[PDB]
């Protein structure tokens, strides 16, 4: 993975040694090249994963997440140019350095072959994320958002550190390839009940699991646009990715420990989807939609079936491009009216005709219109949960109805109707804004032509 | 609020409109329109206000019991089929300031004349503010009605958004 780690590190000298007026151009161009070379990870086999060395390996699960992660860095740089224009040059270059550090930690996180190495990198993503929220957020609440995002993750991650170190002392290794062959069943005892909680609580808080999600509406809303994009597109998927790996060494105890979390997620789906029906803040409505979409991922991972795993991987990638697109669309309005209230600016389809087309496509993907990969992932998770218990179709069905109501309510409330009379600074959409949306939705739809590359190892 | 005179006239208009819906045919409506007019005539010049209110209050109950469940509504009136049908074509005038010069080059006369209006609005604003800063009572306005122009050459205060408003059939 040194062919990707080293070029990412070299994005830092490039930013710092570039001309003052070329920092965005240089960093954007070379981050798109690193994204281009990420396609070489697609050299996957039907039996064995890519095992590069003693430290890093890539399989069909980490590869789509790696490609998504490296694709978002250029998009984050585009989305941040406007609101950082009136910023000190050194502080503009420190903002980019935090984004590059976040990618550096993420690419090493998804390919780490040893669980403790995964833990350190999984935990190191907090520092740059915390700094982006608290330093370059706009409102007062960014300080409290950072504290919630920080202490929710460490309250669950620290017990995971003890559990991992305990596993190495008893099994002898934490290399993920070794665990595939040396794994042993988990006898049902009170000691193993808490090894299960310690091995899964960190990932569920980061998903997030309903009830432990209170950090997400704060952090995802108060962060700058680049922070929100990475927060919702790649950093929620560290929890899902971890559970996919860690669940290998928790059988059979997962078949009864999963009930309290399958119940929280299934019922959390309906609660979080319902909250969106009454959200006054547009950016907050999008934040709660992630909680409802990651509820399906938790359920799929916990019921442990080939179809649920295939759906989970497609959902994480599909949700990554859609939620990220929605935040950029919402930030497009904010940069004109400088308010997050959804009902402030209305009828925007009569003033920004083309940006209303992106709203439509971003809304259709969010409500899982077939055959988008959003529907493929969601459908695969409904099929698997039906076999688990036929009654689940009721809860899955109700969430689909609510999802369409708050997806189109957002579209109707902000785009249709009469325009607000006293808002007269709605300038025509920039080429930067339009190209930012096209870089979200076009890959999201092209994947429908070749879905297999995002269906995960179980394919 | 509405004075007793205004409430009676409104009920008469509503009574005839709903009655027109029941009758449909013009000749039949022209018959019951006269009979309903007579009922408004037997008490045309009532003197006791308390009695007049009891007559008006009882007419409403008869109106509510007799109103058409699906009254006729003009196409462009609130609740009508064509209501707000063209609000999507109604763009404000300030959107023209964001046009590219190439688009403005297609309408050199329109934008030359639009510049004159912008100058007229810009020159008369400071006078319009004063015209309202002096006629307003000490506390603040007690009604929503604006005063006209008092000096020759002045424009009615707060005129731009009622004069430049989009047409009813913009496209």
């Amino acid at each position: 993975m040194l062919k990707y780690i080293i070029p990412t590190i070299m994005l830092m000298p490039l930013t710092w040694l570039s001309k003052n007026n070329m920092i965005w151009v240089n960093s954007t161009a070379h981050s798109l090249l690193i994204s281009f070379t990420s396609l070489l990870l697609m050299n996957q086999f039907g039996d064995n994963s890519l095992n590069f060395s003693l430290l890093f390996f890539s399989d069909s699960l980490s590869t789509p997440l790696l490609i998504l992660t490296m694709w978002l860095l250029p998009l984050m740089l585009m989305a941040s140019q406007h609101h950082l224009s009136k910023e000190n040059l050194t502080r503009k270059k420190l903002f980019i350095t935090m984004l590059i550090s976040l990618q550096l930690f993420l690419i090493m996180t998804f390919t780490a072959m040893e669980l403790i190495l995964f833990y350190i990198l999984f935990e190191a993503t907090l520092v740059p994320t915390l700094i982006i929220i608290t330093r370059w957020g706009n409102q007062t609440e960014r300080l409290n958002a950072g504290l919630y995002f920080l202490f929710y993750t460490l309250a669950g991650s620290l017990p995971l550190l003890v559990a991992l170190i305990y596993i190495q002392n008893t099994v002898g290794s934490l290399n993920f390839l070794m665990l595939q062959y040396w794994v042993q069943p988990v006898h049902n005892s009170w000691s193993n009940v808490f090894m299960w909680l310690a091995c899964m609580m960190a990932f569920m808080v980061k998903m997030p699991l309903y009830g432990l999600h209170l950090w997400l509406p704060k952090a995802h809303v108060e962060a700058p646009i680049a922070g929100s994009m990475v927060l919702a597109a790649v950093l929620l998927k560290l929890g899902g990715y971890g559970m996919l790996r860690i669940t290998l060494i928790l059988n059979p105890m997962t078949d009864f420990m999963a009930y309290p979390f399958i119940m929280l997620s299934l019922w959390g789906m309906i609660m979080t989807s319902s909250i969106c029906l009454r959200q006054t803040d547009l950016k907050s409505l999008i934040a709660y939609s992630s909680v409802s979409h990651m509820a399906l991922v938790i359920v799929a991972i916990l019921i442990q079936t080939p179809w649920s795993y295939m759906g989970a991987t497609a959902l994480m990638i599909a949700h990554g491009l859609t939620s990220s697109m929605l935040f950029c669309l919402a930030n497009s309005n904010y940069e004109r009216i400088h308010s997050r209230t959804m009902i402030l600016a209305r009828g925007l389809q009569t003033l920004l005709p083309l940006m209303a087309t992106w709203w439509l496509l971003a809304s259709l993907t969010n409500l899982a219109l077939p055959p988008t990969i959003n529907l493929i992932g969601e459908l695969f998770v409904v099929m698997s949960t039906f076999s688990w218990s036929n009654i689940t179709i009721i809860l899955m069905g109700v969430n689909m109805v609510i999802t369409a109501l708050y997806s189109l309510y957002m579209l109707i409330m902000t785009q249709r109707g009469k325009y607000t009379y006293h808002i007269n600074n709605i300038s025509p959409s920039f080429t930067r804004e339009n190209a930012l949306m096209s870089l979200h939705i076009l890959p999201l739809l092209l994947l429908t032509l070749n879905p297999k590359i995002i269906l995960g190892p179980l394919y | 609020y509405l004075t007793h005179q205004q409430k009676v006239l409104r009920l008469y208009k509503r009574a005839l409109r709903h009655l027109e819906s029941w009758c449909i045919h013009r000749d039949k409506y022209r018959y019951f329109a006269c009979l309903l007019r007579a009922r408004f005539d037997e008490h045309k010049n009532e003197k006791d206000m308390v009695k007049a209110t009891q007559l008006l209050r009882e007419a409403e109950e008869e109106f509510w019991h007799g109103q058409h469940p699906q009254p006729y509504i003009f196409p462009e009136s609130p609740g009508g089929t064509s209501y707000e049908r063209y609000e999507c074509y109604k763009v404000p005038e300030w959107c023209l300031d964001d046009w590219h010069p190439s688009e403005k080059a297609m309408y050199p006369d329109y934008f030359a004349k639009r510049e004159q209006w912008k100058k007229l609005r810009r020159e008369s604003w400071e006078r319009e503010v004063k015209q309202l800063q002096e006629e307003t009572p000490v506390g603040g306005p007690r009604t929503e009605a604006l005063p006209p122009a008092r000096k020759q050459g002045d424009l009615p205060p707060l005129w731009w958004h009622i004069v430049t408003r989009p047409r009813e059939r913009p496209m």
């Binding site: 009569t350 003033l351 920004l352 005709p353 025509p428 959409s429 920039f430 080429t431 | 763009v91 404000p92 005038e93 959107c95 023209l96 964001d98 046009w99 590219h100 190439s102 688009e103 309408y107 329109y110 989009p166 047409r167 913009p170 496209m171």
Partner: peptide, 12 residues
């Protein structure tokens, strides 16, 4: 009578 149609900028 060939009036002017006010529409938002379509150039961009």
């Amino acid at each position: 009578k060939r009036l002017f149609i006010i529409k938002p900028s379509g150039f961009y």
